[PDB]
């Protein structure tokens, strides 16, 4: 076959595939390809922003632990 298997690929092919995936994905929910604006991207990025903020706070707390531990009594 021509496209079967597990052969090599290039960077331009990676974005190209993801473009068809978004376009066919919204086609299942909105039934139109006009795609004036692409809200799927934004809804996805918003999740990424949420998790990143959580990791930043988590790391911010660890920094506080070294600045002021539990054994400092009296």
């Amino acid at each position: 076959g021509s496209g079967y298997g597990l052969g090599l690929s290039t960077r331009t092919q990676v974005t190209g595939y993801q473009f068809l995936a978004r376009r066919t994905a919204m086609a299942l929910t909105r039934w139109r390809v006009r795609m004036e604006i692409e809200p799927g991207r934004r809804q996805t990025l918003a999740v990424v922003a949420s998790v990143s903020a959580a990791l930043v706070i988590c790391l911010g707390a660890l920094l506080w632990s070294f600045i002021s531990p539990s054994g400092q009594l009296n």
């Binding site: 920094l63 070294f66 600045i67």
Partner: protein, 50 residues
């Protein structure tokens, strides 16, 4: 800044003078890496002109 601050609370206080020159010179490099992305063109489409 967090990496630097963490050392002072531990009491090593290795910074000041000789030691401080590293983060000082290091800080310039990060700023230099970001500004390089800014020089992309010579055109304007600012809200005031539209």
């Amino acid at each position: 800044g967090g990496m630097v601050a963490m050392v002072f609370a531990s009491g090593s206080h290795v910074f000041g003078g000789i030691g401080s020159i590293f983060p000082l010179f290091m800080m310039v490099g990060i700023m230099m890496m970001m500004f390089r992305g800014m020089g992309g063109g010579q055109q304007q489409m600012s809200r005031p002109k539209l």
